Every structure is written in structure tokens, then in C-alpha cells.
Amino acid sequence: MSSLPVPYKLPVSLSVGSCVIIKGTPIHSFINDPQLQVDFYTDMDEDSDIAFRFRVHFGNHVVMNRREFGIWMLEETTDYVPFEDGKQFELCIYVHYNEYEIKVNGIRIYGFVHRIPPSFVKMVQVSRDISLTSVSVCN
């Protein structure tokens, strides 16, 4: 009631210069493998292609990938996961001409190069072990 439903599904239109800003807090931190997942889908169905999946294993690493016609492509990872148990974070995903830039609390942690045009994204889903306070899509 203090937070948004998770999983969370938001229709979006993205263009270069757009952003998706997610404010939330890691929860269930006492479980073995707490996670956060953000998916950029090309349609409202969860069976549609995923232009970009950002999946954090808190305290461990992030895995990023894309899905086309049900098939996952080669993933990318980084160990830089500057989140804190029980503390609110600001996760910023900026849509540049060439990549999604991901920032956590003002710090760039990765750039995921576009494999399809970001204008093809129609929905953002946020899932797993967070309390979600706000999602903002820049004008």
C-alpha cells in the first residue's frame, strides 16, 4: 500500500533522449539469492521480444541480455552492483543513440548497446525482490 505492485508493467514509448527512472528498495534480503529484474518488451505480451533485460543478483552481479522469437542471445555481465540492503536506490536507464546507459545512485555501471531500435520498446516490466516506490519516463 506504501508501494507499487511487483511485478509491475508499464506501457511506454521510448526515443533517444528518453529515460526510465526506477525508485525502490531491495527487500527479502534475508533469502539466499535476492534479485531485481527490469525488462524492456516490444509488446504488451510477456511472450513478445525483450530488447533489454537487466537482472541484478544483489551483492553479486548483473546479467544483461535480449530475447528474439523466444530465444535468448549472448548475455553480458558486470560485477558492479552498488546497491544496499534496505536502502532506497535510484536506478536510471537513459536511452542514448547507441546504448542504454544504466546508473545506480548517480554512478554509471554499464552501457548496453541497442540490438534493436529503442523505439520498438512498448512496455517496461519490473520484477523480483524490491519494494517499488516510483517509475518515471522522461519527456
Side-chain angles (χ1 to χ4, degrees):
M1 203 77 238
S2 35
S3 72
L4 288 166
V6 177
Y8 177 83
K9 295 180 180 67
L10 175 64
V12 301
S13 220
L14 298 183
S15 57
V16 174
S18 289
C19 82
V20 177
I21 312 307
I22 295 163
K23 285 263 220 286
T25 297
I27 62 176
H28 316 147
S29 298
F30 60 92
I31 74 182
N32 183 64
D33 187 8
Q35 294 166 48
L36 160 65
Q37 187 175 299
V38 182
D39 292 300
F40 287 4
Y41 279 93
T42 62
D43 220 281
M44 237 62 28
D45 313 75
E46 291 196 33
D47 290 308
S48 73
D49 288 357
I50 295 168
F52 175 47
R53 170 175 288 184
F54 176 83
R55 185 172 178 178
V56 180
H57 294 263
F58 287 117
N60 200 292
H61 69 290
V62 196
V63 185
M64 292 154 286
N65 208 344
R66 177 213 161 207
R67 192 181 72 198
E68 183 183 348
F69 200 73
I71 292 134
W72 288 99
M73 298 301 158
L74 175 69
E75 80 194 27
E76 287 169 43
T77 66
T78 178
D79 289 357
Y80 193 9
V81 284
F83 300 90
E84 276 166 58
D85 284 356
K87 289 301 306 301
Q88 187 177 78
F89 59 77
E90 182 190 77
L91 175 66
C92 301
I93 302 167
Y94 296 109
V95 184
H96 300 275
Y97 282 123
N98 53 342
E99 67 181 14
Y100 300 105
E101 173 182 39
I102 305 98
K103 292 195 176 174
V104 175
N105 299 321
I107 300 174
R108 178 185 164 106
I109 69 158
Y110 210 77
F112 183 87
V113 169
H114 297 306
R115 264 80 136 174
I116 64 176
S119 68
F120 288 13
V121 173
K122 297 177 197 148
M123 184 264 279
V124 175
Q125 185 184 283
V126 182
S127 63
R128 303 193 188 268
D129 306 294
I130 68 162
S131 183
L132 178 62
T133 300
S134 66
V135 180
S136 303
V137 183
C138 286
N139 205 16

